[PDB]
Amino acid sequence: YFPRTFTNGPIGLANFLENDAWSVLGTKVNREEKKYTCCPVNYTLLHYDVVIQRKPLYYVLNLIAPTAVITFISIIGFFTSSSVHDLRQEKITLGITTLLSMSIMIFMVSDKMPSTSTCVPLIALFYTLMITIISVGTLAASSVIFVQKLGSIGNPPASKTMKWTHRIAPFVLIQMPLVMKQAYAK
Amino acid sequence: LIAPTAVITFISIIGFFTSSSVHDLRQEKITLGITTLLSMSIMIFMVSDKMPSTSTCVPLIALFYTLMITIISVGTLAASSVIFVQKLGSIGNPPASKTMKWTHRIAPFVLIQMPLVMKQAYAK
Amino acid sequence: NIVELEWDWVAAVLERVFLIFFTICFLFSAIGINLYGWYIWYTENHFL
Numbered sequence: 001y002f003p004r005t006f007t008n009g010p011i012g013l014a015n016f017l018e019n020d021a022w023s024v025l026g027t028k029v030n031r032e033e034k035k036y037t038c039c040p041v042n043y044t045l046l047h048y049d050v051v052i053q054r055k056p057l058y059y060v061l062n063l064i065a066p067t068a069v070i071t072f073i074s075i076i077g078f079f080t081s082s083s084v085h086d087l088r089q090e091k092i093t094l095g096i097t098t099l100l101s102m103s104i105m106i107f108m109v110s111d112k113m114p115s116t117s118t119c120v121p122l123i124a125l126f127y128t129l130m131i132t133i134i135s136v137g138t139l140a141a142s143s144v145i146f147v148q149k150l151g152s153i154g155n156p157p158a159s160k161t162m163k164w165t166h167r168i169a170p171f172v173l174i175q176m177p178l179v180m181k182q183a184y185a186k
Numbered sequence: 187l188i189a190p191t192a193v194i195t196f197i198s199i200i201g202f203f204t205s206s207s208v209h210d211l212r213q214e215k216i217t218l219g220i221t222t223l224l225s226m227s228i229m230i231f232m233v234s235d236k237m238p239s240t241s242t243c244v245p246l247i248a249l250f251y252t253l254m255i256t257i258i259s260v261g262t263l264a265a266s267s268v269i270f271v272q273k274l275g276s277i278g279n280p281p282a283s284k285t286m287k288w289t290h291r292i293a294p295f296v297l298i299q300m301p302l303v304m305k306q307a308y309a310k
Numbered sequence: 311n312i313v314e315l316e317w318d319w320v321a322a323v324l325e326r327v328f329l330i331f332f333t334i335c336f337l338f339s340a341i342g343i344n345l346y347g348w349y350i351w352y353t354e355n356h357f358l
């Protein structure tokens with residue numbers, strides 16, 4: 001056996017029909033003689049190599065962007081309050097709803113996902129990180145309520161606790177409310 | 187597909203920028219935006235048995251769906267900025283003279299009116 | 311408080327500005343894309 005090659009390469013691509021998901025980069029050919037493992041005779045094999053690359057525009061526009069937007073929106077919602085001197089809401093329902101919405105998107109478009117147990121694909125690594133920061137975010141938002149409710153016991157914060165608070169605020173770009181200034185003056 | 191998403195987007199837009207009282211604290215509006223995005227995301231990908239699902243170009247229907255998503259996502263951020271502006275009154279610094287001057291002339295074109303309690307405060 | 315009232319009205323005027331702006335974008339995007347697609351569909355239907 002011997003190979004016959006074309007002008008552009010070993011495999012003719014002049015009448016190829018373009019695919020909507022894959023693109024052909026190149027082709028190779030190799031002729032090899034192999035030995036029988038029982039006899040002192042050879043046989044000829046022809047190897048054809050085809051290199052194809054995926055087109056990620058559909059996945060980028062359909063999965064990555066909506067989840068990134070939703071995660072950012074949830075992050076903004078977690079740490080925003082209408083009034084400084086007011087009790088805050090649970091924020092647990094918002095986190096569960098965000099997780100439910102993101103869980104719906106990943107597994108219901110899973111007709112095209114790899115679904116492999118050999119390794120963790122790039123898209124899989126991206127989705128897990130969004131889940132953890134949402135799950136960690138709902139716990140961090142709950143800790144703010146616990147700190148705020150400590151004022152119902154009647155013990156003022158420690159001197160060092162208040163000292164550290166007043167210096168981080170200028171870098172944080174937060175300002176003391178008017179009613180708090182009036183309490184100090186009184 | 188086109189009609190239900192257009193109706194939902196318009197309803198969400200109306201809900202984003204509507205308040206019961208002018209002199210009252212507003213709600214988060216974050217949950218409404220997420221729910222609208224979740225509802226719209228459900229419709230596009232669960233009827234996707236007939237969608238093109240191609241990576242060569244962006245079809246006309248795909249371009250329509252993305253624009254609705256951005257204005258909803260931008261709308262939830264714009265609604266959050268209204269709360270931040272309103273809460274600036276808790277610091278005690280009155281708005282600048284030029285800020286209040288510009289506000290009173292846009293209002294007649296905007297078709298908004300000053301509340302009665304605000305007029306009484308000026309008189310007092 | 312007069313200071314609170316002044317900032318309350320600034321947000322009220324700003325909110326209505328957003329409402330007008332976001333409906334113009336919605337009308338242009340929804341009507342413009344669908345009408346453009348129908349025009350292409352109509353011409354090829356009747357010119358062939």
Ligand SMILES: *[C@@H]1O[C@H](CO)[C@@H](O[C@@H]2O[C@H](CO)[C@@H](O)[C@H](O)[C@H]2NC(C)=O)[C@H](O)[C@H]1NC(C)=O
Pocket residue numbers: 033034035040041042
């Ligand atoms: C069958 O194929 C083998 C492939 O290895 C051939 O082995 C070559 O033999 C020559 C001498 O005849 C050496 O100079 C080469 O180095 C060998 N190849 C390699 C890769 O080492 C063999 O000649 C072929 N024909 C037979 C066995 O009749």
